[PDB]
Amino acid sequence: SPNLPPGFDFTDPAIYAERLPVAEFAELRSAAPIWWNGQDPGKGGGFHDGGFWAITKLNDVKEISRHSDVFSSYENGVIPRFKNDIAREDIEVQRFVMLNMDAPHHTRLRKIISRGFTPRAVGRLHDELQERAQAIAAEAAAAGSGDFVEQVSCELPLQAIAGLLGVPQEDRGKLFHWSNEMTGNEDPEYAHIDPKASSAELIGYAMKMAEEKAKNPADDIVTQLIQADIDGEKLSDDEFGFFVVMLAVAGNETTRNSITQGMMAFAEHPDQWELYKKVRPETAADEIVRWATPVTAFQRTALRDYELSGVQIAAGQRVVMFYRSANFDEEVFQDPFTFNILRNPNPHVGFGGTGAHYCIGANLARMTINLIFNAVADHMPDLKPISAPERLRSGWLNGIKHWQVDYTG
Ligand code: HEM
Ligand SMILES: CCOC(=O)c1cc2cc(-c3ccncc3)ccc2n1CC1CCCCC1
């Protein structure tokens, strides 16, 4: 029924290198909110099961996220697209990080790692991130023009991870280098990167950091993570290393692409940009995340038969939650295609559907976004784009590689 091209794959990186398949996502919400996306032989992005169920409705995304007992993140990982020829064991490597664990293993890890995302712990970063956000902005304005991504979006998200982990200043340069080589392998601009090499360098440094803190324990997030709680629970040295590797991407290109596409949206909607500069509403962060949806989609795997909204899902089959579609569901949003930074409440799923795996760094991201746009307004309120943004070739990330901008006008 649904009017779609033969051979169409919603995880095809060819599409996302050009555009977002908004019209195609809308077609399914009307004609087939849960639609079997078949994949030709050898074109499964690393999965040889023949296709997956596209999930386009927000309520369906929420049901899958909260029914993590049926819909597993471990079985096949949550990334729904790699290079088609990727070895299976390269996919299973994901299972070493919390994102791709099921309960009970995931439950133990999440509980320990929560010590580093308490509201207090994130608040201690406000002043330092505000200071840097202002300086980044001032630095870019002085340049007159350049790559908005590298000059505005790139650094601060990484400074949040470093500050959260108490990484020494002199170490941050190489730490950022490694973190930025973790994803984007499919884009021709980054074909030469080896995410496996830089990850090993990341774990080696993180494990090194963990054994030093045990011998010289101070008050910071790293020490609380490697010390036994009242329950005797804590992160082993390697578990802390897989924690760092997870942050290096989970809080890197996600927050970055939200800053970029957030500024892109402000350029598209001058009314909203004048409004922001005057009142600086912090509800803008959630609207920027909904508008940007930096993670286009994560997948799950059904461990048993499951009926979801009148559609039979069979054990072993993959379901791909398309957050880019759920965040523009006409059923839950009044004018989903209206950029409204005052939108309140705003139940977007850019941080995922509520449930076990809901982004632990959601509020840190919100604060990063708010601090940097306040700085953009303070230091370059009349910036205008020079050329169209350059999109990233990815099957699940909605990335912006470059964006030329004039900060003077
Ligand atoms: C705009 C910024 C961000 C977006 C769009 C985003 C998106 C997401 C999504 C969709 C998930 C999976 C949710 C699910 O499976 O139900 C997730 C999980 C996660 N995020 Fe984020 N995230 C952002 C920022 C951050 C930051 C700044 C950090 C840390 C510094 C972070 C750390 C994590 C971690 C550790 C997980 C795994 C949680 C688990 O598996 O239990 N994220 N994020
Ligand atoms: C020992 C584990 O370390 C890794 O190898 C690794 C972890 C990881 C996590 C994310 C990630 C993505 C999104 N949201 C949060 C996290 C993306 C890529 C990742 N990789 C590299 C990649 C190399 C080979 C194929 C899969 C893994």
Residue numbers in the entry: 19 to 427
Describing publication, verbatim:
Breakdown is then initiated with the conversion of the C‐3 hydroxyl group to a ketone (cholest‐4‐en‐3‐one, cholestenone) by the oxidase ChoD, and further oxidation at the C‐26 “tail” region via a three‐step process involving oxidation to the hydroxyl, aldehyde, and carboxylic acid species. These sidechain‐modifying reactions are catalysed by the cytochromes P450 CYP125A1 and CYP142A1 (CYP125 and CYP142 hereafter). Comparison of the effect of complementing a CYP125 knockout in the CDC1551 strain of Mtb (which does not express the CYP142 protein), with CYP125 or CYP142 reveals that the two enzymes are functionally redundant with respect to growth on cholesterol. Here we present a series of compounds based on an ethyl 5‐(pyridin‐4‐yl)‐1H‐indole‐2‐carboxylate pharmacophore which bind strongly to both Mtb cholesterol oxidases CYP125 and CYP142.
The introduction of a methylenecyclohexyl group on the indole NH, compound 7, maintained affinity with both CYP125 and CYP142. Upon inspection of the corresponding CYP125 ligand complex X‐ray crystals structures, it was noted that elaboration from the R1 position (N of the indole) dramatically changes the binding pose of this series. In the cases of compounds 7, 8, 10, and 12 the ligand is observed at a greater distance from the heme, typically with the pyridine coordination mediated via a water molecule, to produce a reverse‐type I interaction similar to what was observed for the inhibitor LP10. In the case of compounds 7 and 8, which feature an aliphatic ring on a methylene linker, it appears that movement of the compound deeper into the active site is blocked by Phe100, leading to a distance of 3.9 Å and 3.3 Å, respectively between the pyridine nitrogen and the heme distal water molecule. R1 position are observed significantly closer to the heme iron, with compound 10 observed at 2.4 Å from the distal water. This is likely attributable to the ability of the additional carbon to facilitate positioning of the ring closer to the plane of the indole, as opposed to compounds 7 and 8 which extend at an angle of 67° from this plane because of the geometric requirements of the single carbon linker. In the crystal structures of CYP125 in complex with 7 and 8, Ile97 and Phe100, which form part of the loop preceding the B’ helix, are positioned below the R1 ring structures seemingly blocking further ingress of the compounds. In the same structures, Thr201, which is found in the loop preceding the F α‐helix is observed in a different conformation relative to that which is observed for compound 4, forming a hydrogen bond with the sidechain of Glu271 and further restricting any downward movement of the compound.
